[PDB]
Amino acid sequence: MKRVLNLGNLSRIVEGDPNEITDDEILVIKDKIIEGKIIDIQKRVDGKLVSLITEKYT
Amino acid sequence: MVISINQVRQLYVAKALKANTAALTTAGDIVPKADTAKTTLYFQSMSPAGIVASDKINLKHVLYAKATPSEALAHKLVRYSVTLDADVSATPVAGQNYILRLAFRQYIGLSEEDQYFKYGEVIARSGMTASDFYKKMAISLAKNLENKTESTPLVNIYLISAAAASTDVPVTSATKESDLTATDYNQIIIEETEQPWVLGMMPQAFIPFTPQFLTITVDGEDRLWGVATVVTPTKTVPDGHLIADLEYFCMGARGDIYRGMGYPNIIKTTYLVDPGAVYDVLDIHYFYTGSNESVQKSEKTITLVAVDDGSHTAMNALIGAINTASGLTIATL
């Protein structure tokens, strides 16, 4: 057990508009219908804002 | 209800129209009197204490004469419509304090520097549909507004089911969620109130309000969660109290101006306006000029009030008789 990233790279975990998320920062999309849950973690790669969570099916 | 006068204003009530002065029996009977020519106009008004008569109008010196339809004096209660802002979100976001701020102007004072604020609070939960939010928001408003120990009644809260869309359902501090059972509550309505009124003491007045919203944190930014719309009202004040306070004031130009001040040592004045009815108003303006050096005018206003049956029947009868006896052409209602 140890920390996952230096706090410098964790201070750039933000909550905002997908259109203003550049690199050197990760995006979190909070859920509305559910209070504490999250919807997706996102990271831009080539202008597109892709997810870091692998899709899981039945 | 003190008003401004162009050197004077007098009031006479027309509870019934007569043909001659030999028929003035009841304490509201009136009749217009004028010469066989058209040189002077005056009214024989039956008072509760005998016949009287207005000042004499020189028809060469009549400035303006016009009636009102009794609906130009009704005050429509300012109605609002609160709603969730679809742009932000068409539903509440769990974990956010959906506060509402009712800003009141013309609180106890009479200026607008005299302000007063009343709040509502709804902390949203997961799965809180919109109807439940409006319900809980309306109730929080009622509770915070009408605490049994709150002197002035400020606003009336309402709710509208999307099924009806017209029949607003009330929400009092005695109301309970159990009483509000529907699930398609579309919006929250807020409306003015007829403040208390006392003849000669407490004039007809209202407290203006505007629903102001507080910020919530939607996806990343602080944004207002609602919409304060000014919808067309559906309720009026029937003008009865304005005329009563008008008579109260305009009968001091014709009598006791103290109206109760030195209490045991007063004169008792009777009033013929029924506050609770609705009146249509006739108003005449004119002046008096003197001779060689006394050319200065003294403008005057003689005011009449009749009862509006909805068709302006009585006031039309007045205007007919006045025009027949004076040659004027006061336009009917």
Curated annotation (Swiss-Prot), chain B:
Signal peptide: none
Quaternary state and interactors: Interacts (via FD region) with the major capsid protein.
Top-rank taxon, per record: Viruses
Protein's UniProt name: Auxiliary capsid protein
Region of interest (FD), ranges: 75-237
UniProt remark on domains: The central region FD is structurally similar to Helicobacter pylori flagellar cap protein FliD.
Subcellular location: Virion
Cysteines paired by S-S bonds: none
GO cellular component, one term: viral capsid, decoration
The protein's role, per its UniProt record: Auxiliary capsid protein that forms an outer layer on the major capsid protein protrusions.
Keywords from the UniProt entry: Capsid decoration protein, Capsid protein, Virion
